[PDB]
Design a protein around this ligand. Structure first.
Ligand SMILES: [Cl-]
Ligand code: NA
Length: 382
């Protein structure tokens, strides 16, 4: 028989994506579910609507030189074995050295470093692990390496901005052929560095310029046009007012959409937030619980043509072992049909801040919840 259409396919998104007969676009695609003129932007994988929960594995790649010291695969393979055994479907990881003092692991021999990254992606292909590289994890590091002030991220003529383009090109060219790579994320929590009155280093508009240059370069190189994401935390309550007035006045909802747009520009359609044990407050709507915060974030995303995801949220070590604190996140994300949510943080040896490892009480707490909620997500549709 002729194979059935994507909607006629009874398999799930991840199952259809990872099947041997899949020959569709790689990575997360943005489509829309339509009711008349209403187009709700939504994530697709394997041509079906995606709903999944996974983990951060911050050091999935960088452990190859930060821990193993040789750009080898010893710890990577041990880590992937755990991810497979625990049934982790999706992982976010850092795709660059945290410190400029370790940039030599790339520049000493660029082809060796990129070969280890290619190998990681190949291992994830074979083991059916979807990964999201977060390319400029610590935004301090590139300006430091270039002996430039941090604001040069927003200056297209700077060595910092050139390095961003050159490194983006290197990563995308290495990874674009791998079906495990499902999205490209700029870096980690860049928005939190902007417009701080008593720590004044960069403006939201400068960050936006870097995001726009990143997204344009990725779009130029990636024939699969998979999701380009920010890696932002939540916007600060006052994110817009810090930029425009240098004040800590909580933003209105309209101002939140505005500043979200600055921090998710152009071709960057992945609206990341990180959900800590902190509430969202609007000057007009007030202080909200997490359910209403997610509903408001998804409403902002939809209006902007973006898709929301929770790139980090509270894990067992941050919760001091209170499973109810963690469970509250999963309850909300399932109820509000959040399409990707990633708990902080799995580390092979548990040696990353606020992280868990396998076969411990905190590890089991996280992985049991992850499996429990992927079982519920696995039938979700809209
Ligand atoms: Cl490490
Ligand atoms: Na642990």
């Amino acid at each position: 028989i002729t194979p059935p259409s994507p909607e006629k396919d009874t398999r799930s998104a991840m199952e259809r994506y990872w099947a041997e007969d899949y020959s569709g676009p790689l990575g997360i695609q943005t489509g829309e579910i339509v009711s008349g003129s209403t187009k709700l932007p939504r994530m697709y994988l394997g041509e079906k609507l995606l709903y999944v929960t996974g983990v951060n594995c911050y050091n999935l790649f960088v452990q190859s030189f930060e821990s193993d010291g040789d750009l080898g695969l010893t710890s990577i393979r041990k880590t992937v074995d755990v991810l497979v055994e625990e049934k982790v479907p999706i992982v976010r990881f850092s795709c660059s050295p945290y410190s400029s003092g370790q940039f030599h692991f790339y520049h000493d021999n660029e082809s060796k470093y990129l070969a280890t990254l290619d190998s990681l992606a190949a291992i994830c292909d074979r083991n059916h692990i979807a990964i999201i590289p977060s390319i400029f994890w610590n935004t301090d590091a590139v300006p430091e390496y270039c002996k430039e002030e941090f604001g040069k991220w927003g200056d297209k003529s700077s060595e910092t901005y050139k390095y961003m383009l050159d490194y983006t090109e290197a990563v995308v060219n290495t990874l674009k052929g791998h079906k495990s790579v499902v999205a490209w994320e700029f870096g980690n929590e860049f928005n939190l560095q902007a417009d701080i009155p008593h720590n004044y280093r960069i403006s939201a508009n400068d960050v936006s310029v870097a995001y726009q240059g990143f997204a344009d370069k990725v779009a130029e190189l990636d024939p699969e046009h998979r999701l380009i994401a920010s890696g932002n935390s939540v916007m600060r309550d006052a994110q817009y007012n810090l930029l425009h007035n240098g004040s800590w006045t909580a933003d209105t909802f309209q101002q939140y959409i505005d500043i979200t747009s600055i921090f998710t520009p152009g071709k960057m359609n992945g609206m990341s937030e990180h959900n800590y044990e902190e509430a969202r407050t609007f000057s007009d709507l007030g202080k909200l619980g997490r359910s209403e915060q997610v509903i408001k974030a998804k409403s902002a995303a939809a209006a902007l043509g973006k898709v929301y995801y929770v790139g980090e949220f509270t894990g067992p070590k941050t919760a001091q072992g209170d499973s109810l604190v963690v469970r509250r996140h999963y309850i909300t994300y399932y109820a509000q049909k959040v399409q990707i949510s990633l708990i902080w943080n799995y580390a092979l040896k548990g040696n990353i801040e606020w992280s868990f490892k396998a076969d411990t009480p905190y590890g089991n707490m996280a992985f049991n919840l992850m499996r429990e909620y992927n079982e519920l997500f696995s039938t979700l549709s809209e």
